Design a protein around this ligand. Structure first.
Ligand SMILES: Cc1cc2c(cc1[C@@H](CC(=O)O)c1ccc3ccc(OCC(=O)NC4CCCCCC4)cc3c1)OCO2
Ligand SMILES: [Cl-]
Length: 291
């Protein structure tokens, strides 16, 4: 369990960013590591077999905007990024979940297309394959895995921001709707802690949110928990040592450098550190420290 860092990749401030930085919750330290080959915001991060994966996003630059189908893998042992097989389609504002060593890429946009499509990556074969699409097109979708089931939460379908959510059952290759959230949320941070799927922040169509709600898979209910100290949309999120960490985002005025930590035992959020600069739209994941 020791020696794990919170990695933040990419993001957005004025333009899409190539930063890879790692935070050590045990000593407060930040490390700047190998840049992404291509700056990207709206990407997702995940970890399989100790490798950090950056999936999709968009390169926003003064010389254009390209939605990304890329899957790039970072090895902390080498501090090197390597290209992996690309997805079938570009996916900006994607969500990602891992089940049994496989990466699921969910939704996202390509130009004006809002995807319902979903695809699954097999590291052992370096191949992607499409699976059943969601019941709703979703960009800015939050994705988490609980009990080897994949959840897609909120987002924007091209016309409406969503409070709906749905669950993918891999052995049936089938999506089913679940209880909708109490709040419409696009660009929320979604993760799993204990038996619950948490949805923190986001945009409801009018304001950035500091509210946080959690879905109990047993009771099929969403319940609000303590709100964040800051309103945040397009925030990064991960879980580390039984706590939720939220990184950055946009509060309606500033791109935040704040990192907050939620303790479920006290139902409190605390400010724990600041990123090296404010940004939104980052990919976040946890893996061993580099060398
Ligand atoms: C969440 C959101 C907030 C907004 C908004 C549009 C959205 C949605 C889309 C929607 O509701 O159609 C959204 C959802 C998920 C995202 C995930 C990543 C992501 O990275 C690129 C990025 O970081 N851009 C930033 C520039 C400043 C304003 C836009 C949002 C932040 C963007 C995301 C955007 O318009 C202004 O506030
Ligand atoms: Cl964008």
């Amino acid at each position: 369990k020791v020696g794990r860092l919170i990695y933040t990749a990419g993001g957005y401030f004025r333009q899409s960013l190539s930063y890879l930085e790692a935070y050590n919750p045990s000593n407060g330290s930040w490390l700047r590591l190998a840049d992404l080959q291509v700056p990207r915001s709206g990407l997702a991060g995940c970890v399989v077999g100790g490798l950090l994966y950056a999936v999709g996003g968009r390169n926003n630059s003064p010389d254009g905007n390209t939605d990304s189908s890329a899957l790039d893998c970072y090895n902390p042992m080498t501090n090197q990024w390597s290209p992996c097989a690309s997805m079938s389609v570009p996916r900006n504002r994607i969500g990602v979940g891992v089940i049994d060593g496989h990466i699921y890429a969910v939704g996202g946009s390509h130009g004006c297309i809002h995807h319902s499509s979903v695809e699954r990556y097999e590291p052992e074969r370096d191949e992607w394959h499409l699976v059943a699409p969601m019941l709703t097109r979703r960009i800015g979708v939050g994705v988490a895995v609980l009990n080897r089931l994949l959840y897609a939460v909120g987002g924007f379908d091209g016309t409406n921001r969503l409070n709906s959510a749905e669950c993918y059952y891999p052995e049936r290759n089938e999506w089913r709707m679940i209880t909708p959230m109490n709040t419409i949320r696009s660009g929320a941070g979604v993760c799993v802690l204990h038996n619950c799927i948490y949805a923190a922040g986001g945009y409801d169509g009018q304001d950035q949110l500091n509210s946080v709600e959690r879905y109990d898979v047993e009771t099929e209910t969403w319940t609000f928990v303590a709100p964040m100290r800051h309103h945040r949309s397009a925030l990064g999120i991960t879980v580390h040592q039984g706590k939720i960490y939220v990184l950055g985002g946009y509060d309606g005025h500033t791109f935040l450098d704040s990192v907050e930590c939620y303790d479920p035992d006290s139902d409190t959020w605390s400010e724990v550190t600041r990123m090296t600069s404010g940004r939104s739209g980052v990919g976040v994941a946890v893996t061993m420290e580099p060398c």
